[PDB]
Homeobox protein Meis2 (Homo sapiens), 123 residues
Amino acid sequence: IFPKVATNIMRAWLFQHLTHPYPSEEQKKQLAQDTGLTILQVNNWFINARRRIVQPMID
Amino acid sequence: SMGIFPKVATNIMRAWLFQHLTHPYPSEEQKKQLAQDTGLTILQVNNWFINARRRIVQPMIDQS
DNA sequence: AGCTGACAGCTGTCAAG
DNA sequence: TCTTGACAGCTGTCAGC
C-alpha cells in the first residue's frame, strides 16, 4: 500500500526543500503520481517527515 | 465549495451534543447515523464536532 | 460584524513489521 | 523491535455569510 520506491523520491524532494518543506498542491500531485501514493499518504508523510527529520536537524 | 450545510442539520447535531456532554465523541456508528439524519458528510460531521468541542463544550466547562 | 463551517498542518498515539 | 505509516482529534486560521 506504501510502495518502498516512494521513500527515496519523497526524501529527495524533502532534502531539496529543507528551508520550506511544504509542497504546493501541484507538487503533492506530482509526488503522489510519481510515487504511486495517494494524496493522503503524501500529506501524512510530510507531516511525519517535518517532525521526524526536519525539526530534529535544527535541534 | 460545492458543499452544502442542510438547514435541518444544526439542531440535529446540537441535540446529540447536548445529550452527550460528558463524552461528546460520537462513535463511528453514531457518526454515520448523524450523517444520514442530517444530510452531512462524515467529514462535515467530524469537523462539526471538532468545532463544537472547543466552541461549546469547553467554554461551558470553563465557567463551571 | 461577528459566527461558524471549513481545511492545511500539528499532536498524540499505536499496530505491525 | 524499534521504527514509521497511519489516523482520530486538535490547533491555527480564513472567508462568506
Residues 1-59 of chain A form a domain with the Arc Repressor Mutant, subunit A fold (CATH 1.10.10.60). Residues 1-2, 40-41, 44-45, 48, 52 of chain A lie near DNA strand D (CB under 10 Å from a C1'). The first helix of chain A runs from residue 6 to 15. Chains A and B do not touch (no CB pair under 8 Å).
